[model samples]
Target: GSSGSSGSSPSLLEPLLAMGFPVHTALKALAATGRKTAEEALAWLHDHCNDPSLDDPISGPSSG
Candidate 1:
């Protein structure tokens, strides 16, 4: 946990806070097919790595 008080489990928001991924994005990555892990986030990222919609907030739901 960033503050050591992230006070949550499967907290993608804490460790990757510096990266600043939107909460929803983090959530999606947080649970891939109901599996949670840093690797799960990475796997999700890899699959959607170049999505154009993930680029602009206006074009899609804003994460941050």
Candidate 2:
């Protein structure tokens, strides 16, 4: 079995949200890219920066 580094997975949305990306957009990018890492998310965001639907809500049950 793999060893644990921490109790929880990193909040991939933290940096993006703090940097001014809308919650939906950040979540969308994360979902599209499998939520692997912040750097990968940033690259995806850069590529889709001009997407008209970037601000649209993603399809999922809201957690909060």
Candidate 3:
């Protein structure tokens, strides 16, 4: 194994994660929009609001 970890785990992810959005939805939006702030995350959500991919339980990786 490598040395111990030191980098902070994206403390900026707090507010967006606290918004109660699905973990997958929130994470994807953040990646899609470069997640500078919660505002950016929400804006991504608003733009992709009509996407049904996140509308149901099967939105993420399917079970085997």
**CA lDDT of each candidate?**
0.56, 0.68, 0.64
User: Any residue pairs clashing in model 3, and if so which?
Assistant: none
Compose the digit string of candidate 1's lDDT tens values, residues 1-64. 3585453664556654446566667666666635455556756765664476666232333452
What's the best-to-worst order under TM-score?
2, 3, 1
Task: Sort by lDDT, best first.
Answer: 2, 3, 1
Clash pairs of candidate 2?
none
Best model per TM-score: 2
Measured against the true structure, the TM-scores of the candidates, in listed sequence, are 0.46, 0.59, 0.57
Q: Write the per-residue lDDT of candidate 3 for residues 1-64, one digit (tens) a residue.
A: 5756542575446766776666667777787887577789877876665456546332333431
Off by over 4 Å in 1: 1-10, 33-35, 52-64
**What is the clash tally of candidate 3?**
0
What tens-digit string does per-residue lDDT give for candidate 2 at 1-64? Answer: 5876532543987887887777677777787787788777777887676455554333323331
Name the regions of candidate 3 deviating beyond 4 angstroms: 1-10, 56-64
